[PDB]
């Protein structure tokens, strides 16, 4: 299958530089012009840059022109976006994509998975995982969860019982607290009859700061 | 190349 | 150069009905217009290309139309799975690609009252100096919900933060979590910690309280 995978995302200090790469597979890379598209935390798509099939034609949106450079290697099916003089507005999810070309018959549109870039002077800090234990806060089913507090930057991924527990899980979107740190919570509804019998472990992954924290949430005495 | 010649016009 | 404007900003509709999304271009772009779908949390996916042609794996309920300056995307039998944001994108100025600001489709469903659960702070966090009290509202519709923390019948402010999951693709509900962050000292100085929920599914405002050490 066709695949576009971006890499290089991370936190970068304001004014600093970061280099994003896009690995292509499953299609003739050298035939397609390649774009970068970015998306602010809750905003829409914003086109950023385009690199021609051969690599001698480039264009950049005015807001990143003079700070971003773009390159491609058709022998590795890779493309690179070199960002410099980064500022707060550049904080986004960054996608690489083919967006139809210029032919009368539009060429296929592929979208990458995307990579997160955070432009911030704050330091990378791992999560403190605190239990949300089941208690008399149940209906008929019981709710339990994990509180992921004071981490930077995003993403954290939460799975339950190593992904075996998927039904009923809700991982709320992360919120930036008054401290410049992120707080997230993940919950799951389970049968109350299994609280004394079945172990429930939340698996918090924070790839930015090196941490994999596993927390067992035990029912409260209640 | 042909295609490159037109793409220079577009750019 | 080619600005795309999308209307409406938001559209809420019941399943099986028909949505019509508009994208107007500041200058003619012929048929060189495409529609993308993004379910938030996931990357975009092309939906319509050349303004009327479906892309791979796109069901036939989706249909595009128009040319020149006016364009429409039509969804005929709305499914809950179509809860998403839709973007239009022109390629007429091929070195200069532009996107529209986006249009969100929310699926209407029967009104569902929230399941409200309170979570006392964990002793482990308490000895760190902070107390986080979590109020969870689970599987409700519509989205509009008012969550108000009260400590010893004293309404709170500035010390709460809320986060809403995206609308679920199958049951069309929302879930909300309000987090009350407190000092270890202020927490131990009070007894009644409540979370009052106001919602269309509730006949009267509902208060969810726990008494510290009780």
Numbering used by the authors:
A (entry chain A): 1 to 140, 143 to 224
B (entry chain H): 813 to 823
C (entry chain B): 1 to 214
Task: Quote the paper.
We use an epitope-agnostic approach to identify six monoclonal antibodies that bind to spike proteins from all seven human-infecting coronaviruses. All six antibodies target the conserved fusion peptide region adjacent to the S2' cleavage site. All six mAbs bound to peptides 42-44, which share the 815RSFIEDLLF823 motif. This motif is located within the SARS-CoV-2 fusion peptide region, directly C-terminal to the S2' cleavage site.
The fusion peptide did not form as many interactions with COV44-79 and COV91-27. However, R815, E819, and D820 contributed H-bonds and salt bridges, and I818, L822, and F823 made hydrophobic interactions. In all three antibodies, R815, S816, I818, E819, D820, L822, and F823 contributed the most buried surface area to the interaction. Notwithstanding, these antibodies have neutralization activity against SARS-CoV-2 and therefore are able to interact with the fusion peptide on the virus.
